Amino acid sequence: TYEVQGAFYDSIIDSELLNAQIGINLSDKQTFKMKSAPRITGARCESEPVDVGVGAPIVYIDTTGEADY
C-alpha cells in the first residue's frame, strides 16, 4: 500500500527547496492498496478412461491471483 501526495512546482521552486517541500503547498495524501501478482497454487492433469479410443488430455491448474485477465 502507498500514499500519494504531490503538486506542481514552478520555476521559483528550487531542487533543494523542493526536497524540503517548504513552499510547494503539496496536495493532501491519499492511501491506496497495490494489487498482487498472480500465482499458481497447484498443477495437475486428469482425463477420463475410455472404452474405445483415447482419453483426451486435460490440464487442471488452480491459481491464487487477482488479475483481471
Binding site: 475410455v50 474405445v52 479410443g53 483415447v54 482419453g55 483426451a56
Partner: protein, 69 residues
C-alpha cells in the same frame, strides 16, 4: 508384385469371416478391417450413406487430439 516381393491387397480368412481391404501400411495397418468375432465393422477414413439407422451414436475421440462432434 512390387519388385521381388508381393504385397497383400485383400484377405478373406476361413476360420474367421475377416476381410481386410486395401494395400497394407508400412506399419501393417489395413485401411478397412472386419471382425464377425467381435461383430464389429472397422473402417478407417470416411463412410458415406444415404441414411443410417442405429441405437447409439456414441461419438469417440479416436485420435489423440480429435474433436468428436
Amino acid at each position: 508384385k512390387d519388385g521381388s516381393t508381393w504385397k497383400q491387397t485383400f484377405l478373406i480368412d476361413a476360420a474367421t469371416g475377416a476381410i481386410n481391404i486395401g494395400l497394407l501400411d508400412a506399419e501393417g495397418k489395413a485401411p478397412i478391417s472386419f471382425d464377425p468375432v467381435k461383430k464389429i465393422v472397422n473402417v478407417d477414413g470416411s463412410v458415406i450413406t444415404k441414411t443410417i439407422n442405429a441405437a447409439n451414436f456414441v461419438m469417440t475421440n479416436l485420435t489423440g487430439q480429435d474433436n468428436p462432434a
